[PDB]
């Protein structure tokens, strides 16, 4: 009943197995002779065991700047920071003499250290295709008062599949079991591909390209503060032998996005691929099928509404003393029924029936005389 | 006396032509004229007309959305009329399960407040508006003047490619005429001085204007109505379920990379100033004073500069001052004089290669110091 209202909807009918294609933002309605009508939707795609390959720094900050110099011929200066792996250091030469605190005139050694702190990062993950979990929701056409257009899941059986565990049998309370035999059909091969995750954005990129990025990194093993290649975001400037300066190279966030234009983007995990499934319905049964026909009169709870695919939805309530009973329905015969074998459970609870009316003027007849409803449609 | 200690130092001996640049000092000498030290202390672009200001890092705040049921028209927010907001109209799937009596494509509208976090401004600078600051320090052998980088001993002078020629007066030495010619690296015409925080570059005008970033015109400085906000903002609605507004991330480092093949600026500029110096109005201070009679003392051990020259600081004891210091080994601090017995004197001289004898004063109490170059 979930598909009712979804624009990207398919009506798959089985001859007298049934093959369906599920993907994100797409719903599927399945029908078969003397079998219940079912609604399928791919609710979530997830990469589960991800091995971090490398983590890169895209925005950094330099703090705790410290400098030490020596007078000419007094040797090389040193800071403890040169042994701290979170610090970036550089040795240079400055002009020393009487006017800047030295007895001799010459090139005095200098050393500048600063604390490299990462503000933003992006991690590249290796994902095994077989570790890609899919979440499918199966909702039967139960004509329930609340089931129409419901996106919660309080009416649908959730089921999980993986390219390995491709086939699953799923039980539906009152309809029996349904066998699901799903085949994986992703867009890009995860082998030699890296799932590059940047905050809320994500992409699938070539391994060599990823490793060849000129940015400070931490290995997959060290998930640490000892960023390798700090030099790629840090610059030391001493052009006139007067002073050494340490400068951060600025955020590579937008730079990365631009570099990632000709790459497979991922929405956020909403993946490009589709799941080609096969459906066995031999273990499925129409709920009721043994119930007798309704004798009483019906009331129109909600004005007949048309879906984006030309089909119509009728909300009706029972009044007679027959329930649980089969609702008599006809579109004179011209149009077909989507909510096959419509049944009443309680007089109080209304029923939603979806049917395909014929092109032009039609007559929707619900119930048996006396008190027969003869509604009019125009498709 | 400023040049003593500076590695990038030139000894120009004579009009006299000199070349001043940043981190470079120049020592000038002429027959019966005082020895002078020149340094280019500051280069400044003075009347800069902001051409355009670009946003390199932005933030989206105050996100608001309004939708309509199918056939109920187009939604609207007041924000669509606020110029600090970026908005977009789209279509979503509407129906019974999401609050509509009808099933169809209901119109949606998403607005968010575009706030700039970081910018870079491009400035048009007139070549003639480029002010230079030169410091002239005479070789006065003063106790504090040696290696001093303050300016409490040097006459500051300002020049511009227009006002290229200036006469500068030195208290006790007369006046010095300097006729400077501009020699910058890149022509400021069709060039834009792109300033990003503490970094700066000189770039092509067309390239600058053709940058795909949000911008405020030179006229609107301090405005909030950023043009082209779209360049840093993205609206995502792939499944007709929801519209999302996303910031495109800092272009700071991106810009630095794009600016590799550009003339970088540290305002410390690339160019040099080729000057001409007229010293006819300059005079040696003393020149009329008599020779010192007394004995001299060695205040500080003789030190060698990076250019082989030596510096001697000495104090007077006799009752002759103000008087000319007798000196013999060429001399850099020409006509060394005593002003007060209390105040020592710094004399810079070029010793010969190998063993030499630095003789300061007249007998009795003559100093006969030894050098090895």
């Amino acid at each position: 009943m979930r598909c009712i209202g979804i624009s990207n909807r398919d009506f798959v009918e089985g001859v007298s197995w049934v093959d369906i294609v599920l993907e994100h933002g797409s719903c599927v309605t399945t029908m078969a002779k003397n079998k219940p009508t079912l609604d399928f939707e791919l609710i979530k795609t997830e990469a589960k065991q991800p091995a971090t390959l490398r983590k890169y720094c895209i925005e950094a900050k330099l703090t705790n700047t410290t400098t030490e110099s020596r007078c000419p011929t007094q040797g090389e200066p040193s800071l403890n920071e040169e042994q701290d792996k979170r610090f970036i250091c550089k040795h240079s030469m400055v002009d020393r003499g009487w006017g800047n605190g030295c007895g001799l005139f010459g090139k005095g050694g200098i050393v500048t250290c600063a604390k490299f702190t990462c503000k933003k990062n992006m991690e590249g993950k290796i994902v095994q295709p077989e570790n890609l979990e899919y979440t499918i929701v199966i909702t039967p056409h139960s004509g329930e008062e609340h089931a129409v257009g419901n996106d919660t899941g309080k009416h649908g059986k959730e089921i999980k599949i993986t390219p390995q565990s491709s086939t699953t049998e799923a039980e539906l309370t009152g309809y029996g079991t349904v066998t699901m035999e799903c085949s994986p059909r992703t867009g890009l091969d995860f082998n030699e591909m890296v799932l590059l995750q940047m905050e809320d954005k994500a992409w699938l990129v070539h391994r060599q390209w990823f490793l060849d990025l000129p940015l400070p990194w931490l290995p997959g093993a060290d998930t640490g503060s000892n960023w390798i290649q700090k030099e790629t975001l840090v610059t030391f400037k001493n052009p006139h032998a007067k002073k050494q300066d340490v400068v951060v190279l600025g955020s590579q966030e937008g730079c990365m996005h631009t570099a990632l234009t000709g790459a497979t983007e991922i929405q956020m995990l909403l993946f490009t691929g589709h799941l080609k499934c096969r459906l066995r319905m031999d273990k499925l049964q129409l709920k009721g099928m043994s119930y007798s026909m309704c004798t009483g009169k019906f009331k129109i709870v909600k004005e007949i509404a048309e879906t984006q695919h030309g089909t119509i939805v009728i909300r009706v309530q029972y009044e007679g003393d027959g329930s649980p009973c089969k609702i008599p329905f006809e579109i004179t015969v011209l149009g077909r029924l989507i909510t096959v074998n419509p049944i009443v459970t309680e007089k109080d609870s209304p029923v939603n029936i979806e049917a395909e009316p014929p092109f032009g003027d039609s007559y929707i007849i619900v119930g048996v005389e006396p008190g027969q409803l003869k509604l009019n449609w125009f498709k | 006396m400023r040049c003593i200690g500076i590695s990038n130092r030139d000894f120009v001996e004579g009009w006299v032509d000199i070349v001043l640049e940043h981190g470079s000092c120049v020592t000038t000498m002429a027959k019966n004229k005082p020895t002078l030290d020149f340094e280019l202390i500051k280069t400044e672009a003075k009347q800069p007309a902001t051409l355009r200001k670009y946003c390199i890092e932005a933030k989206l705040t105050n996100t608001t959305t309004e939708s309509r049921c199918p056939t109920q028209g187009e939604p609207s927010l007041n924000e669509e009329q606020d110029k600090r907001f970026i908005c977009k109209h789209s279509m979503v799937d509407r129906g019974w399960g999401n609050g509509c009596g009808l099933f169809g494509k209901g119109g949606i509208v998403t607005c968010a407040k575009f706030t700039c976090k970081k910018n870079m401004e491009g400035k048009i600078v007139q070549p003639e508006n480029l002010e230079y600051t030169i410091v002239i320090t005479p070789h006065s052998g003063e106790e504090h003047a040696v290696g001093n980088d303050t300016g409490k001993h040097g006459k500051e002078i300002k020049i511009t490619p227009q006002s290229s020629t200036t006469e500068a007066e030195l208290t006790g030495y007369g006046t010095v005429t300097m006729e400077c010619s501009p020699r910058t690296g890149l022509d400021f015409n069709e060039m834009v001085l792109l300033q990003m925080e503490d970094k700066a570059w000189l770039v092509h005008r067309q390239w600058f204007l053709d940058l795909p970033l949000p911008w405020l015109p030179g006229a609107d400085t301090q405005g909030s109505n950023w043009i082209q906000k779209e360049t840093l903002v993205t609206f995502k609605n792939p499944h007709a379920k929801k519209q999302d507004v996303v910031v495109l991330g800092s272009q700071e480092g991106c810009m630095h990379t794009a600016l590799t093949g550009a003339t970088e600026i540290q305002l410390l500029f690339t160019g040099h100033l080729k000057c001409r110096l007229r010293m006819d109005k300059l005079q040696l201070k003393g020149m009329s004073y008599s020779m010192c009679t007394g004995k001299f003392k060695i205040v500080k051990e003789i030190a060698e500069t990076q250019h082989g020259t030596i510096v001697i600081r000495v104090q007077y004891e006799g009752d002759g001052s103000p008087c000319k210091i007798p000196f013999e080994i060429r001399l850099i601090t020409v006509n060394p004089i005593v002003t007060e017995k209390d105040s020592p004197v710094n004399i810079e001289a070029e010793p010969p290669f190998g063993d030499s004898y630095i003789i300061v004063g007249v007998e009795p109490g003559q100093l006969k110091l030894n050098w090895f170059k």
């Epitope: 030490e68 110099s69 800047n100 | 980088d149």
Partner: antibody, heavy 131, light 110 residues
């Protein structure tokens, strides 16, 4: 030659304050500047120092990273930005010049180890009460 | 680390001579070579009396002198006057880049 401090007053525990100091009568840009404090009825306690360039900023051990020293050379101003203040920080804060370093390094840049120094010019001090 | 210790108090009579010591723990010869002394009169700002262990700035009375060794630094006040009643502080480097004051000595002129 004078140093005049400003920005002192009553602050709540955990609060922030920015002290300022106006310098006059000397070549400010070429001198190291220090902050010294004195709790009521207690001794002088060294807080921080800054070189000409601001490239060297040193702090006493009790300033874990709560205080930031800064300067504006053209404005002849010294600052002390203070956050997460406690009763331990209640004191008179003095703005101080290192006049003797100027006679050895007239640039005021070089952060040589154990440099000859002398705190020769002091302001009257500004009172900070964390209460 | 370097920690500077001074006597808490010293009493003297007018015309007499008094010596205030400044002794360090994790200190060395350079600690004392760099000692500076400050006089703080009641209700007044501190005043530099000595720098570089033994140097007296111009304007400071010749009654103030100082001495240094490899183990201590001392300030001597000759011909004690009532105006000498003050707190005296020694100062030196705690580390290569930080300074520290001694606890101070309260001098009472009886």
């Amino acid at each position: 030659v004078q140093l005049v401090e400003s920005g002192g007053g009553l602050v709540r525990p955990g609060g922030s304050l920015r002290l300022s100091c106006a310098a006059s009568g000397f070549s400010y840009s070429n001198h190291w500047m220090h902050w010294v404090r004195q709790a009521p009825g207690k001794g002088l306690v060294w807080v921080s120092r800054i070189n000409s360039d601001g490239s060297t900023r040193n702090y006493a051990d009790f300033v874990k990273g709560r205080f930031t020293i800064s300067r504006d050379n053209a404005e002849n101003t010294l600052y002390l930005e203070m956050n997460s203040l406690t009763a331990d920080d209640t004191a008179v804060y003095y703005c101080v010049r290192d006049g003797v370093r100027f006679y050895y390094d007239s640039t005021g840049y070089y952060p040589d180890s154990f440099f000859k120094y002398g705190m020769d010019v002091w302001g009257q001090g500004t009172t900070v009460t964390v209460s | 680390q370097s920690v500077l210790t001074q006597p808490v108090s010293v009493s003297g009579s007018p015309g007499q001579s008094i010596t205030i010591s400044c002794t360090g723990t994790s200190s060395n010869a350079d600690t004392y070579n760099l000692v500076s002394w400050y006089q703080q009169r009641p209700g007044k700002a501190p005043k530099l009396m000595i720098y570089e262990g033994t140097k007296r700035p111009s304007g400071v009375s010749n009654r103030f002198s100082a001495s240094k060794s490899a183990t201590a630094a001392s300030l001597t006040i000759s011909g004690l006057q009532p105006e000498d009643e003050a707190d005296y502080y020694c100062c030196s480097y705690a580390t290569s880049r930080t300074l520290v004051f001694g606890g101070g000595t309260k001098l009472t002129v009886v």
